[PDB]
């Protein structure tokens, strides 16, 4: 007997037909567009979407004006709106099924860095985010997969305690200044 959780789960599903070709080609394209690290990063999004679609289906199988559906569906829609995937006005559950990977990728941090100028190419963007150069709201978001809430998009900019965001310059520029001071001068 202990404290301790043991409550976990995989964030993804591996594909059955492992060399579909058209599947591989599509997934690669998705890594290109949004400078993703690896295939499993695609697959975890595919899995998250799939859950949502699974919920949408289940709610649709229920009768309309059943409290279970009305509550959960509304909550699922509000959740999707909050991340800036579904549009207000388009909130009525049958629209969830008509939705795609591309939308979920688009609202990463790595995207909304690159999207709001800030980066200069998506691979730059991902590096920045890793290197503690951008801050969402007030926290230095180290992680690119950080799905940016629609609410909290316009509060994405550079980290205050950094070179790019107006602060102490990084160690390389400091080294070159010391070299020019003592070595050259």
């Amino acid at each position: 007997p202990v404290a301790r959780s043991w409550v976990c789960r995989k964030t993804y599903v591996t594909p059955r037909r492992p060399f579909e070709k058209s599947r591989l080609d599509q997934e690669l394209k998705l890594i290109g567009e949004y400078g993703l690290r690896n295939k499993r990063e695609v697959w975890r999004v595919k899995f998250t979407l799939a859950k949502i679609r699974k919920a949408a289906r289940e709610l649709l199988t229920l009768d309309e004006k059943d409290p279970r559906r009305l509550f959960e569906g509304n909550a699922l829609l509000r959740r999707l709106v909050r991340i800036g995937v579904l549009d207000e006005g388009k909130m009525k559950l049958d629209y969830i099924l008509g939705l795609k990977i591309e939308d979920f990728l688009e609202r990463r941090l790595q995207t909304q860095v690159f999207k709001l100028g800030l980066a200069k190419s998506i691979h730059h963007a991902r590096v920045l985010i890793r290197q503690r150069h951008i801050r969402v709201r007030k926290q230095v978001v180290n992680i690119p997969s950080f799905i940016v809430r629609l609410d909290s998009q316009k509060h994405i900019d550079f980290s205050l305690r950094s070179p790019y965001g107006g602060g102490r310059p990084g160690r390389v520029k400091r080294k070159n200044a010391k070299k020019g001071q003592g070595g050259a001068g």
Binding site: D25, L28, K29, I31, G32, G35, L36, R37, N38, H123, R126
Partner: protein, 57 residues
């Protein structure tokens, strides 16, 4: 019947060769970038009866 003699015949008398040098190859995302770039943007040419990613005449 049949002897256990020649055991490692071909592994033995093969001509040994040095494994060359080239470069520290790109890894992780960088690799995947590079492979994306050499299917979808760099080449995309006028076709001449199908392609071959390890082709050789």
């Amino acid at each position: 019947h049949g002897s256990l003699a020649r055991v490692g015949k071909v592994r033995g008398q093969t001509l040994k060769v040095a494994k060359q040098e080239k470069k520290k190859k790109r890894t992780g995302r960088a690799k995947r970038r590079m492979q994306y770039n050499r299917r979808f943007v760099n080449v995309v040419p006028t076709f001449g009866k199908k392609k071959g990613p390890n082709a050789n005449s």
